[PDB]
Design an enzyme around this catalytic site. Structure first.
Site, PDB file in Angstrom:
ATOM      1  N   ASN A 186      -4.592  -8.651   4.232  1.00 45.60           N
ATOM      2  CA  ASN A 186      -4.763  -7.138   4.492  1.00 45.60           C
ATOM      3  C   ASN A 186      -4.401  -6.389   3.386  1.00 45.60           C
ATOM      4  O   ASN A 186      -5.065  -5.089   3.394  1.00 45.60           O
ATOM      5  CB  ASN A 186      -3.784  -6.714   5.861  1.00 45.60           C
ATOM      6  CG  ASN A 186      -2.448  -6.395   5.249  1.00 45.60           C
ATOM      7  OD1 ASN A 186      -1.893  -5.150   5.251  1.00 45.60           O
ATOM      8  ND2 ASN A 186      -1.546  -7.396   4.765  1.00 45.60           N
TER       9      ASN A 186
ATOM     10  N   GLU B 236      10.180  -7.240  -2.138  1.00 42.93           N
ATOM     11  CA  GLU B 236      10.600  -6.079  -3.078  1.00 42.93           C
ATOM     12  C   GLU B 236      11.840  -6.348  -3.409  1.00 42.93           C
ATOM     13  O   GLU B 236      12.740  -5.906  -4.340  1.00 42.93           O
ATOM     14  CB  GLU B 236      10.535  -4.939  -2.466  1.00 42.93           C
ATOM     15  CG  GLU B 236       9.032  -4.175  -2.503  1.00 42.93           C
ATOM     16  CD  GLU B 236       8.237  -4.747  -1.509  1.00 42.93           C
ATOM     17  OE1 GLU B 236       7.024  -4.338  -1.313  1.00 42.93           O
ATOM     18  OE2 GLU B 236       8.597  -5.541  -0.624  1.00 42.93           O
TER      19      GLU B 236
ATOM     20  N   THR C 236       0.874  -1.265   0.129  1.00 39.94           N
ATOM     21  CA  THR C 236       0.000  -0.044  -0.046  1.00 39.94           C
ATOM     22  C   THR C 236       1.000   1.024   0.100  1.00 39.94           C
ATOM     23  O   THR C 236       2.109   1.262   0.667  1.00 39.94           O
ATOM     24  CB  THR C 236      -0.897   0.134   1.283  1.00 39.94           C
ATOM     25  OG1 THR C 236      -1.636  -1.207   1.370  1.00 39.94           O
ATOM     26  CG2 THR C 236      -1.934   1.024   1.193  1.00 39.94           C
TER      27      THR C 236
ATOM     28  N   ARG D 114       5.534   7.193   0.381  1.00 35.66           N
ATOM     29  CA  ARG D 114       4.980   6.858   1.738  1.00 35.66           C
ATOM     30  C   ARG D 114       5.925   6.826   2.606  1.00 35.66           C
ATOM     31  O   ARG D 114       6.947   6.483   2.735  1.00 35.66           O
ATOM     32  CB  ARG D 114       4.448   5.504   1.549  1.00 35.66           C
ATOM     33  CG  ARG D 114       4.025   4.995   2.889  1.00 35.66           C
ATOM     34  CD  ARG D 114       3.199   3.459   2.860  1.00 35.66           C
ATOM     35  NE  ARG D 114       3.666   2.596   3.998  1.00 35.66           N
ATOM     36  CZ  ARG D 114       3.500   1.306   4.060  1.00 35.66           C
ATOM     37  NH1 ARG D 114       3.097   0.585   2.979  1.00 35.66           N
ATOM     38  NH2 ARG D 114       3.489   0.753   5.109  1.00 35.66           N
TER      39      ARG D 114
END
Ligand SMILES: Cc1ncc(C[n+]2csc(CCOP(=O)(O)OP(=O)(O)O)c2C)c(N)n1
Ligand SMILES: Cc1ncc(C[n+]2csc(CCOP(=O)(O)OP(=O)(O)O)c2C)c(N)n1
Ligand code: SF4
Ligand code: SF4
Ligand code: SF4
Ligand SMILES: [Ca+2]
Ligand SMILES: [Cl-]
Ligand SMILES: [Cl-]
Ligand SMILES: [Mg+2]
Ligand SMILES: [Mg+2]
Lengths: 1231, 247, 123, 62, 123
Positions: free
Chosen positions: A995, A63, A30, A113
């Site tokens: 999630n 990642e 996210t 972020r």
């Protein structure tokens, strides 16, 4: 050429990324997840890139894996891209140095972020992109949805021609999730801008065995520095390349950009330098203030890296006397943040005029950066000129914040209509707002903007939509604060949230409620709202959406009704056209099934239009009587911190209200009492068999078993019905199942599994139960929990223990929480919990709600979330600390035994030393020591006394989901289990990354549908359990509450008591799985999971092997043939059957085959006579030896890597042959 | 007392790190490998730290793992240290933000080494330490073998009293492998400089089910910013604390 | 056919000499003979058991089939399409361009509990 | 910054800040940037500030 | 056929045949190999190796198991066997060698094998 489109930043940049890329190695995080998912859908839909190919997309384990794959693909000549943010970007850093180092044309699209420090945040700021500024990647920022598209294209084009990788970034959520009507280019146009010569060179220099080269050499001091500087020419040219492509793209779009762009008064004396979405709001303010004569301006940073001072100054008015650089980050201890330092260097290097330069920090974790705040920044430059300030918060601790006057006038362009919608999760408000945006944007010349605020709560959460429509472009990158239209789709909000805050005089306020009569309205509508409506002369409208929906047959669903209200009362379109457009879309959308569904919606609109009549209220509302304070007793912390936050006032809390290290106290969820269940269970004592299974299964701890003595029920309410406690050990006690109606989520699991055919639990409307059960729960909560009557680890006895995890924000019916709650009932008072990021960290610790709590003695789980990738290692560290500190305690204990300590103290020390790692004995003697040493502060006994919190053996647990265990954290989990240390790992297997939006994990089963497995996963479930069992010294077991609660409790005790590593994998149902009959069937689904053979239960216990017995034990039976119905009862399998029956049939058959073979394998394991039964351990002693000591030949090489303080002695380096060969040579050359 | 010895930067630093730590989670990487190995040898020889205990050392699967374990040990109240450089340090970055964010007294000893870009290099430069300058760790540099000993001590003492993690770094090879005759301090002398009250407070605030709290929450836009600025007071005191311990 | 094939033979008993011919094992025997003796015997035990397991694997008739690849089909479908209850939560983490549509969020009980309540109330 | 200036001779007319690193595309390496900010914030005398790079990968610095 | 195409399209620079001509270095099927030691495969790169093998793609991983981190100075790895002396296992490793081979065989669709040149060059 071009084409209009309403979408968000994510989709706008993915549009370009897809076209310009051949390969994409990804991982979800996210708020960048959307980009990867859109790309996957487009590939499956047949979308082609500029080469006429479908994008080759692959998902990695993290990642770090994605960056490595991106590097390999680029090295091998394929145009590659990836999408990431925050924690994800950090894991890519190592490969970024390599990608830029090798001059590869990669492009990373990042939704900037916040980084997890004192707390985790999925929201927007530049902490992540600034963290990678030294990697060598060029960095291009977009400040709006439209810019995200344009910059994404420039980045790709520039990377290809310059050979320098790019990082295109835009603000997480503020830009990534903001919806805007924009213009996008066709893929053909993008393709025409590509430098074919550069592209061909890229392919030719790439890795290929037909013309190979070596890359990634290791270099010494003699040539490394030179090699590092050899890329200088490429970096000197990228700025010009970027500028040229901005111009080329502009020739196609009409939107021009420069490395640095200036807006505002040409003779500005005060200038702001900023980057990202803040630039849009700043420019909006400038247009407003400059019109009043203010000499202000703004320099927008497009190309952050490389930083070209020449371009910066080209945008700087010579008249600027004061300049403040805004950084959306915080680097503790630095003399200043990144952008500020770069600007300072520009002026020092120029060596001429030196304007006053100020540094300011804003928007961390999507903190609002509104016009009022911009005003503060400009005012600061003409006033106090505070430096290194913060704006958007009240820093009353260090005083670095600028005061903000929220009376600042609205700065939106003329004609802008602003709307706010307060909705309840799952009521369709958000979906309707999005459709409204599409409809309006596609049928008018108006620009449209949409932004949605959600809740941390997963079920019954509140949503607030912010929409804007205007004739002029919308640059308002901030929430709506002065709305023309405000709608409240949930009557319950009327008394808890300040819904009319900032509404404009004469504004429109629409309310969904059944309070039609003037008497009812005056009864439920608070005086505060009455006065506001009256004093501001608001066009107040009330509509019983539920009644209308039910009447037209829409089963009370209000989405279509409230949609009509907006289209008719918002004032964005002329009534006539509005209703027309709305109806046309109702046919567009829906229409799928019988004309009936269409008619119901059509009638809904018509009926709504008619009922939408202005509610006339008396002028007496001008001063309605203010009510009192019926607020129940609560914590000081709850009233001063969590409540304010829960009521959406968190922004008003000053810095002083928080702990410097970010910690929160346990148990704050005890006072939330949300009451969002539609239906709750009603106990029927006449049918109850007092089994406690209902309390055991609850995902929110909403069922409280009560076992009380007669004297304890003296003041018990009249309806506090109790039964004679069944059982021989309970003789004399009274029994009652108390339902906590306000914490219940209405899932239905308890009633679904309640044993008696004639249910002792029946679901009923919340309103028919609360009046009676609320006071009953309060009374019950005061009755001492009888934790000593029955065995703590028995089904019934476990529920007579205090649950230390209650009322979490997990979805109603969540399959993870029941397991955790029970675990706390067995070890809660002495456990440490290292929780991996995921649903369990989200329902487990989303501020300000903390579900974990302490028992009556103040003991409770010490809980912590480090990262997503390190849960095992984090827990291993806690175990290391305990080993070290308790070993220190034991050392002191031994020393105290050889001193003149009293006889009683020595006895207790001896007992403690003997039962040191025994939960029972360590506590028994530790408690004696706490008494015997009370008050001791001197010498040895004093040190031991101060270590009382180390007396009882602790239980270290590592909680995590399947994504963590099977993918990203697997390497660490594997190493920790291999260590042989005493840790307990509990994996809640939801068979998907829950999630983040249901992405496939290696735990996902064959044929299951999930993101990145949209045609059904084509590889089987990874067998984590069997892999770990290869160690032989790790306890491994699988459980499923629904099948056997007994087996679950048995596993918990066996795993926890095992003096080594333990791994327990639990089957956890999840909304993502799409249980057809509701999450209230979770237990039943868990039961079938095992019976069908889908999820077999077993235990692998090394201590049995140590005693000559087979460590493997099978706990369930052979497949019963129900797997087909088990699968079809879940949408994750059923949807595939409806969409691709051919493959679905084959995949479900493959699953049936897999479990058949697996069970047979497990059966053989249970019958084998083959297993290790050697020494348990023992040894160690004191001392060590180097592996090279006394070796006959050199044991280390002549490299700098093996050099050590004691290396360098002469030795035979194997250049003279074997010992025998040397001896033979000596004999032959006798001489 | 003082002791005149001939050794390199790695050993001079390990000498202090061993004395001031209870736990060490490590992973090998040139040119810092020597420190962890020296530490393991000493623990086997029964060398005691200032607490009279042998150091608890464990090797992880990677530096990312070592950093997570360091974070966990600190969170659970144990003075912890690690040794690393270059590629390894990069893998610890995520946890470094966490360690500083939760104001834990960890101490990383780093042999500053080049990062692999156009090529890999095990040699010294400050590319790695600069890559972690935004993590929130205090950063103290030593420029000689003698200074490595001295700064290592200051770093541990200052980390303990300030609650701000420290990264003590010295040049890979040029200082880590250079041998010099220097003087070191006895462990008793190091112990006499420790702020005992700060240490006890560190243990009292640590994770423990006997007096639990929640750490690592997830925060929304309403409070994240304020929470990030709450640690300012601690960073403001760091400089004075370092200066005082140098004295 | 059985995918597992054993290419070497049962331990010939030369492991002791094998280990002692390498300093990495022999150095322990000189410094800590007691422990070295136990650990070398443990290695021999480990390999004995492991070889027996490999032998079992080579004799087993229990195993799945195999297919390199094939299928995929031009297309895909979201896991929530046509679901009876919400498949996504009210979090900004699950928010997507096409999310926001109304659905049963499981706060009213299972399908049958809901149907039964309707029957028991009707009116 | 206060400690940096406490060590700076008032007589200094030229200052060279040496950084042992390379941040491609940066307007300057880390230490240089910190020093520049120190002078900018002081708002007083502005001696000439030079940036120099040395010692990458143990390159000799003689 | 790739070699035939290289001859037949020699000189072709325009249109479709020109594009195909420019891709001759892609004609022959390539063989992708991943080389690494035991420290890589059993420790630090294990999570990545596991995921890549689980993908089912055509890649070849060759692990040179020295049962220690060799280049860096002989540190213990999970591939180090019981009783072997190495750095951080200075009293003889007390945990057995991790069974990477058997772990990967649980997938069923990954080809796994062990070799030893000295025992059999043919195998
Ligand atoms: C390094 C990193 N990469 C990606 C993410 C995003 N992320 C957090 S939790 C998660 C999925 C969790 O899935 P699982 O472990 O199965 O737990 P669940 O939510 O299903 O219980 C993802 C992709 C992150 N926080 N950090
Ligand atoms: C992130 C990271 N951590 C640590 C190192 C240091 N390092 C490089 S190779 C290596 C060990 C290699 O062992 P192995 O894989 O067994 O190969 P061998 O040298 O034994 O053939 C280590 C510890 C590194 N380069 N990168
Ligand atoms: S309906 Fe669900 S949340 Fe409510 S008491 Fe029953 S199991 Fe618990
Ligand atoms: S599950 Fe039913 S029978 Fe059992 S204790 Fe609960 S209400 Fe009683
Ligand atoms: S695991 Fe599934 S059901 Fe539970 S909180 Fe997460 S999304 Fe909801
Ligand atoms: Ca255990
Ligand atoms: Cl996330
Ligand atoms: Cl190395
Ligand atoms: Mg999961
Ligand atoms: Mg090796």
């Amino acid at each position: 050429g071009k084409k209009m489109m309403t979408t968000d930043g994510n989709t706008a940049t993915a549009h370009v990324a897809y076209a310009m890329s051949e390969v994409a190695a990804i991982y979800p995080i996210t708020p960048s997840s959307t980009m990867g998912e859109e790309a996957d859908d487009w590939a499956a839909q047949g979308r082609k890139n500029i080469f006429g190919q479908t994008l080759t997309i692959r998902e990695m384990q993290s990642e770090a894996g994605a960056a490595g794959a991106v590097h390999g693909a680029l090295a091998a000549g394929a145009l590659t891209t990836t999408f990431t943010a925050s924690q994800g970007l950090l894991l890519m850093i190592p490969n970024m140095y390599k990608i830029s180092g090798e001059l590869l044309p990669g492009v990373f699209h990042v939704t900037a972020r916040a980084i997890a420090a004192h707390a985790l945040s999925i929201f927007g700021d530049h902490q992540d992109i600034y963290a990678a500024r030294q990697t060598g990647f060029a960095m291009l920022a977009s400040s709006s949805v439209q810019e995200a598209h344009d910059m994404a294209l420039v980045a790709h084009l520039a990377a290809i021609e310059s050979n320098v990788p790019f990082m295109h970034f835009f603000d997480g959520f503020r830009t990534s999730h903001e919806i805007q009507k924009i213009e996008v280019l066709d893929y053909a146009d993008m393709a025409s801008l590509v430098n074919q010569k550069a592209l061909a060179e890229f392919r030719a220099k790439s890795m290929n065995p037909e013309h190979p080269h070596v890359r990634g050499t290791a270099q010494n001091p003699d040539i490394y520095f030179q090699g590092r500087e050899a890329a200088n020419p490429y970096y000197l040219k990228v700025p010009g390349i970027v500028a040229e492509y901005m111009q080329k793209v502009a020739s196609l779009t009409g939107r021009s950009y420069k490395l640095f762009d200036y807006v505002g008064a040409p003779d500005a004396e005060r200038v702001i330098v900023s980057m990202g979405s803040s630039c849009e709001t700043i420019e909006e303010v400038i247009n407003h203030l400059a019109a009043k004569g203010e000499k202000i301006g703004l320099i927008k940073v497009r190309l952050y890296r490389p930083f070209v001072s020449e371009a910066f100054f080209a945008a700087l008015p010579a008249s600027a006397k004061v300049i403040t650089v805004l950084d959306r980050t915080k680097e503790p201890g630095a003399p200043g943040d990144p952008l500020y330092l770069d600007v300072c260097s520009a002026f020092v290097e120029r060596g001429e005029a030196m304007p006053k330069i100020l540094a300011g920090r804003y928007g961390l974790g999507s903190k609002e950066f509104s016009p009022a705040m911009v005003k503060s920044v400009y005012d600061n430059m003409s006033g106090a000129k505070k430096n290194h300030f913060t704006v958007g918060i009240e820093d009353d601790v260090t005083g670095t914040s600028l005061p903000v006057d929220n009376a600042f006038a609205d700065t939106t362009p003329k004609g802008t209509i602003q709307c706010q919608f307060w909705g309840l999760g799952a009521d369709g408000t958000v979906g309707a707002n999005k459709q409204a945006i599409k409809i309006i944007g596609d049928n008018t010349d108006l620009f449209a903007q949409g932004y949605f605020s959600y809740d941390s709560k997963k079920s019954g959460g509140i949503t607030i939509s912010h929409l804007r429509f205007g004739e002029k472009p919308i640059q308002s990158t901030y929430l709506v604060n002065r709305a023309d239209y405000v709608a409240c789709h949930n009557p319950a909000y009327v008394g808890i949230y300040d819904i009319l805050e900032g509404i404009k005089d004469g504004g429109t306020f629409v309310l969904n409620s059944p309070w039609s009569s003037l008497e009812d309205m005056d009864k439920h509508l608070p005086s505060g709202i009455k006065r506001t409506i009256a004093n501001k002369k608001l066009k107040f409208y009330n509509i019983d959406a539920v009644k209308i929906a039910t009447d037209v047959g829409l089963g009370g669903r209000i989405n279509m009704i409230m949609q009509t209200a907006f289209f008719k009362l918002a004032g964005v379109l002329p009534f006539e056209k509005a209703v027309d457009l709305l109806k046309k879309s109702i046919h567009k959308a829906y229409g799928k099934k019988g004309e009936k569904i269409v008619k119901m919606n059509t009638d809904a609109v018509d009926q709504a239009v008619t009922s939408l009549q202005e509610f006339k209220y008396p002028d007496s509302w001008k001063d309605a009587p203010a009510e009192t304070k019926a607020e129940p007793m609560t914590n000081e912390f709850f009233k001063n911190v969590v409540k304010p936050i829960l009521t959406q006032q968190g922004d008003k809390l000053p810095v002083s209200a928080f702990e410097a290290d970010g910690r929160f106290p346990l148990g704050t969820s005890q006072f939330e009492k949300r009451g969002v269940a539609i239906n709750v269970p009603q106990w029927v004592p006449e049918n109850c068999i007092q089994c406690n299974q209902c309390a055991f299964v609850c995902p929110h701890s909403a069922i409280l078993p009560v076992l009380a003595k007669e004297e304890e029920l003296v003041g018990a309410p009249a309806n506090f019905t109790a039964l004679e406690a069944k059982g021989k050990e309970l003789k004399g006690y009274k029994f009652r199942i108390q339902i906590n109606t306000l914490d219940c989520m209405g899932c239905g699991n308890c009633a679904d599994i309640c044993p008696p055919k004639e249910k002792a639990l029946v679901m009923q409307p919340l309103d028919t139960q609360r009046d009676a059960q609320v006071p009953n729960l309060e009374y019950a909560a005061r009755i001492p929990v009888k934790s000593e009557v029955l065995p703590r680890d028995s089904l019934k006895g476990s529920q007579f223990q205090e649950p230390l995890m209650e009322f979490s924000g997990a979805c109603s019916g969540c399959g993870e929480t029941p397991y955790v709650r029970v675990i706390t009932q067995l070890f809660g008072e002495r456990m440490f919990i290292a929780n991996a990021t995921g649903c369990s960290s989200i329902w487990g610790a989303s501020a300000p709600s903390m579900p974990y709590k302490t028992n009556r003695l103040g003991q409770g789980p010490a809980w912590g979330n480090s990262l997503f990738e390190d849960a095992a290692e984090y827990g291993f560290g806690m175990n290391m600390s305990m080993f070290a500190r308790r070993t220190h305690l034991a050392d002191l204990a031994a020393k105290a035994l050889e001193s003149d300590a009293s006889g009683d103290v020595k006895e207790a020390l001896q007992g403690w030393l003997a039962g040191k790692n025994d939960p029972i004995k360590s506590k028994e003697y530790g408690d004696k020591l706490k008494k015997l040493l009370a008050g001791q502060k001197d010498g040895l006994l004093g040190q031991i006394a101060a270590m009382s919190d180390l007396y009882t053996k602790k239980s270290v647990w590592i909680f995590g989901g399947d994504g963590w265990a099977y993918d990203i954290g697997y390497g660490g989990l594997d190493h920790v289990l291999a260590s042989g240390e005493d840790v307990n790992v509990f994996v809640m297997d939801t068979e998907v990354y829950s999630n983040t939006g249901g992405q496939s994990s290696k735990a996902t089963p064959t044929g299951a549908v999930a993101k990145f497995a949209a045609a059904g996963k084509r590889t089987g479930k990874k067998d984590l359990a069997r892999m770990v069992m290869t160690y032989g010294y790790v306890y491994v077991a699988t459980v499923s509450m629904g099948y056997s609660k007994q087996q679950f409790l048995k596993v918990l005790k066996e795993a926890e008591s095992f003096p080594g590593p333990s791994l327990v994998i639990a089957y956890a149902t999840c909304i993502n799985q799409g249980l057809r009959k509701g999450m209230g069937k979770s237990q039943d689904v868990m039961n079938t999971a095992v019976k069908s053979g889908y999820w077999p239960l077993f235990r692998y216990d090394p201590r049995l092997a140590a005693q000559g017995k087979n460590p493997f034990q099978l706990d369930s039976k052979a497949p019963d043939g129900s797997v087909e119905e088990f699968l079809m009862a879940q949408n994750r399998f059923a949807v595939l059957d409806r969409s691709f029956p051919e493959d679905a049939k084959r995949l479900r058959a493959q699953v049936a085959h897999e479990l058949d073979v697996r069970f047979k394998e497990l059966e053989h394991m249970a019958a084998t006579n083959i297993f290790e039964s050697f020494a348990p351990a023992g040894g160690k002693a004191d001392g060590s030896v180097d592996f090279g000591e006394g070796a006959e030949f050199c044991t280390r090489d002549d490299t700098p890597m093996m050099a050590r303080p004691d290396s360098g002695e002469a030795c035979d380096q194997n250049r003279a042959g074997t010992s025998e060969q040397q001896g033979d040579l000596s004999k032959r050359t006798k001489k």
